[PDB]
Design a protein around this ligand. Structure first.
Ligand code: K
Ligand code: K
Ligand code: K
Ligand code: MG
Ligand code: MG
Ligand code: MG
Ligand code: MG
Ligand code: MG
Ligand code: MG
Ligand code: MG
Ligand code: MG
Ligand code: MG
Ligand code: MG
Ligand code: MG
Ligand code: MG
Ligand code: MG
Ligand code: MG
Ligand code: MG
Ligand code: MG
Ligand code: MG
Ligand code: MG
Ligand code: MG
Ligand code: MG
Ligand code: MG
Ligand code: MG
Ligand code: MG
Ligand code: MG
Ligand code: MG
Ligand code: MG
Ligand code: MG
Ligand code: MG
Ligand code: MG
Ligand code: MG
Ligand code: ZN
Lengths: 58, 137, 90, 79, 48
RNA sequence: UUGGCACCUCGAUGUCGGCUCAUCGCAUCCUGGGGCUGUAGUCGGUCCCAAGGGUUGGGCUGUUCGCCCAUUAAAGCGGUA
RNA sequence: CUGGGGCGGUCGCCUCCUAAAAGGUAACGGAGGCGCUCAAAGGUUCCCUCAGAAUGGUUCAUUCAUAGAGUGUAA
RNA sequence: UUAUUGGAGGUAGAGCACUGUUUGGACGAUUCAGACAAACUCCGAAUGCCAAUAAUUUAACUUGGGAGUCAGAACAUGGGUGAUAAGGUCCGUGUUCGAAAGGGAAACAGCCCAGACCACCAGCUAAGGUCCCAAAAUAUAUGUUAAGUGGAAAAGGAUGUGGCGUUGCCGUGACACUGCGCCGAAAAUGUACCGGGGCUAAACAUAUUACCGAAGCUGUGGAUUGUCCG
RNA sequence: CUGGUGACUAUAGCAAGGAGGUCACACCUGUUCCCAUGCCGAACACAGAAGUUAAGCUCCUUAGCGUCGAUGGUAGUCGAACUUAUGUUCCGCUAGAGUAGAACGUUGCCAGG
């Protein structure tokens, strides 16, 4: 039901659209994390930045 | 030397050389063929030299199809000139050859004779080639 | 005159198709439409036996459909059959 | 040395779509700039002297098929 | 060939209409019916 | 080499030839070793190894270069602003 | 302006390609045009349909012909 | 920003229905087969763009005061130009430098990792690494190479060697594909591109388990500025 | 069932064969009246009804040309990792061509039978 997302890779050197998706996910600094409700929009954001984040199920 | 009798535009962008051969990847007119395995421009002079080698080795007894034609002009600047001041004049004509394309086909001779004629032609070309037969099944 | 085809279940990714063709199988479709795969060597032997427009008894799963070769995709580089279509003769 | 006889171009005219399908537009809004009828005027849409397609009422833009090889743009009142 | 033309009707000094003509094709003094704001009606405006 | 580019230098990086003094590379001019030869011999042709040493004195031209005279085993080709 | 400067060429406007399927997008990149014309070649109502080919005739007629013609002018 | 939905448009590719280019047949220009195109298109994506109403997020706009900037650079990628030359040049797109320290790439603005408020003789990681210089594996399993290949290059040449095979003869030929090596391989102060020592693995290809490694993150204390509830 | 008039990307068309015509739709008859011919009662227009399904038109049958068209695979490509190789790998999207096949229209309203 809930997803924990951790920003595992830096946004330095990443395209601005990927940075914008990182910010819209609520992630702030490297290794910061958010807990969000699982739904297709959140899944799409995660899919866009999957190389930069780690997802686990709560 | 093969070249178009006329073109609409004599000054053309050079063609893209990445990717694989769009078509002409099969022997359709003759019995044996020479298939390119690497990419290069092929010039009309190279085509003429290869054709002469082939026809000389088979004594003009079989028959050859040149499957490529040099449709594309390319320009070259005059010697010792700086950059700019417009595009240079036409220097020659090239055909784009990519892996898979059949360059020449031959018919009317034995397999060994065709193989030797095609080896002699291949040594005149800026690409690596392979002897091929018509594909069945 | 006989050849066993293994049914491909679900979607196969591009990696799956590459691994199949490396292991030596040819993907094919029988036409309900069925996605199958065969062995290239055994297919070559059956085609040699029966001719290009011959008749084959394709063992799809448990059944046995009398099919021919409607079309085939080939790779002139590497000399490899890459896809087969089997039309049920009816 | 030599010289080139080319080197001319006119100003770009910024043609093409100006409002989206499903967008609300006030009357008089230009919907499409074009040379000729690349897209035709449909319902409540006019065609200007320079082929400009514009809305004749307020409403929602709909780009739609017109036969096999043509298309048109209409504007439908929201209500 | 082509010259500028000014049309003015008898009962007005407005001279509000200018137009063009080919001097070779139309050597005459061209006449046309044009609306005259002063008289609120159409009148015979003729090239000067 | 002739160039292309314009990246160091315009509050200065002296330009050609020669003289003096060299130093390095080897695609070796001579000398040393060797294969083939359409190598009889004496001579040659060509290729391989080889950089130890050696490798000119004049006429003309500012010349580099080049031509010529007379030699020499040979009068090598390049790099070092 | 300028792949130093000079010499040569260019300087405003229109169309296309380069231009990466919205728009925009540079080079002394690749191609052309404009500095008008028309008293109808404008408005409106009504009517009409082309190029080419074949077949016959000392332009005339038939059949195929979605335009392969025409649209004042460059695209 | 993403999800869904709708739309505009002609690139990549493809194709030859138009224009143009082109190769073989056959027939009495037509037809058949097969090719080429920035300024060809019967076709046509991925993307990107414009909009509409859900999830996440934090801007956005207007008006006034004050600026600086108008020499850009490399890298990657789509292109023009040049010569599929340039650390060349001109545009599109993204990143970094500029204005960015720290770790890696020997050294090395522009590459890889990563954004330094201050203090610590705490911990976990990134790229990159673990024989010695020099922190951490002379780690584990399987195989390849014998060239110091690794640690700079081609056409082309070859009983080098490993793995797949197809066939002819009855051990062995012919053939094709593929992995790693060999030759082709000549420059100028001095070995002289592995950074050095050295290495036959301390090379290479898979797979695994650990550890090292930054000014990244965490832990402890402190400073300043903000919100929310000292 | 026919006819008028609409909607729909030719799955609707085109072509080749059959059946039909009492009312209707037509071919047809005439040029006196409205009207009409760069010339022509061909067409347009008006009067009609001798005649004929011959044609147009309607129904039935052919996949022949055209049209539509999958699934599967391929090209290309967003993103990512490797990499500098006319590249490789993974992932999502996914053509064009060609194949199976579909298709000899469906359908709203009004009027007649
Ligand atoms: K310039
Ligand atoms: K454009
Ligand atoms: K064509
Ligand atoms: Mg083809
Ligand atoms: Mg108008
Ligand atoms: Mg106008
Ligand atoms: Mg130089
Ligand atoms: Mg520059
Ligand atoms: Mg200076
Ligand atoms: Mg000084
Ligand atoms: Mg030597
Ligand atoms: Mg003297
Ligand atoms: Mg100049
Ligand atoms: Mg675009
Ligand atoms: Mg555009
Ligand atoms: Mg001009
Ligand atoms: Mg002028
Ligand atoms: Mg293309
Ligand atoms: Mg540069
Ligand atoms: Mg470059
Ligand atoms: Mg850029
Ligand atoms: Mg600065
Ligand atoms: Mg730094
Ligand atoms: Mg920054
Ligand atoms: Mg380095
Ligand atoms: Mg360092
Ligand atoms: Mg710095
Ligand atoms: Mg650790
Ligand atoms: Mg140690
Ligand atoms: Mg080495
Ligand atoms: Mg060393
Ligand atoms: Mg090292
Ligand atoms: Mg920190
Ligand atoms: Zn007046």
């Amino acid at each position: 039901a809930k997803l924990q997302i951790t920003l595992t890779r830096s946004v330095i050197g990443r395209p601005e659209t990927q940075r914008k998706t990182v910010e819209a996910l609520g992630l702030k600094k490297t290794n910061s994390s958010v807990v969000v409700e699982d739904n297709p929009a959140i899944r799409g954001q995660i899919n866009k930045v999957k190389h930069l984040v780690t997802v686990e199920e709560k | 030397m093969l070249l178009p009798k006329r073109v609409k535009y004599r000054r053309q962008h050079r063609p893209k050389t990445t990717g694989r051969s769009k078509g002409g990847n099969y022997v359709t007119f003759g019995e044996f063929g020479l298939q390119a395995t690497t990419t290069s421009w092929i010039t009309s002079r190279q085509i003429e030299s290869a054709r002469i080698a082939m026809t000389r080795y088979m004594k003009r007894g079989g028959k050859v199809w040149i499957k490529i034609f040099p449709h594309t002009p390319y320009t070259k600047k005059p010697l010792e000139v700086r950059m700019g001041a417009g595009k240079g004049a036409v220097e020659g004509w090239i055909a784009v050859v990519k892996p898979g394309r059949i360059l020449f086909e031959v018919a009317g001779v034995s397999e060994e004779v065709a193989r030797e004629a095609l080896r002699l032609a291949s040594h005149k070309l800026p690409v690596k080639t392979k002897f091929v037969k018509r594909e069945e099944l | 005159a006989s050849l066993k085809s293994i049914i491909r279940q679900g979607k196969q990714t591009r990696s799956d198709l590459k691994q199949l063709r490396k292991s030596g199988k040819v993907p094919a479709v029988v036409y309900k439409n069925v996605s199958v795969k065969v062995d290239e060597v055994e297919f070559i032997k059956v085609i040699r036996e029966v001719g290009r427009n011959g008749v084959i008894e394709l063992g799809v799963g448990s059944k046995t459909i009398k099919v021919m070769v409607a079309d085939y995709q080939f790779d002139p580089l590497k000399n490899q059959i890459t896809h087969i279509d089997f039309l049920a003769i009816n | 040395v030599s010289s080139t006889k080319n080197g001319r171009d006119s100003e770009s005219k910024r043609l093409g779509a100006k409002r989206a399908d499903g967008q609300f537009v006030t009357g008089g809004s230009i919907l499409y700039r074009q040379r000729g009828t690349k897209i035709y005027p449909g319902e409540n849409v006019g065609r200007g002297g320079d082929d400009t397609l514009f809305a004749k009422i307020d409403g929602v833009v709909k780009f739609e098929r017109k036969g096999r090889d043509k298309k048109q743009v209409s504007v439908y009142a929201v209500a | 060939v082509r010259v500028n033309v000014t049309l003015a009707c008898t009962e007005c000094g407005d001279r509000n209409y200018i137009t063009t003509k080919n001097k070779r094709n139309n050597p005459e003094r061209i006449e046309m019916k044009k609306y005259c704001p002063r008289l609120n009606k159409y009148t015979l405006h003729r090239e000067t």
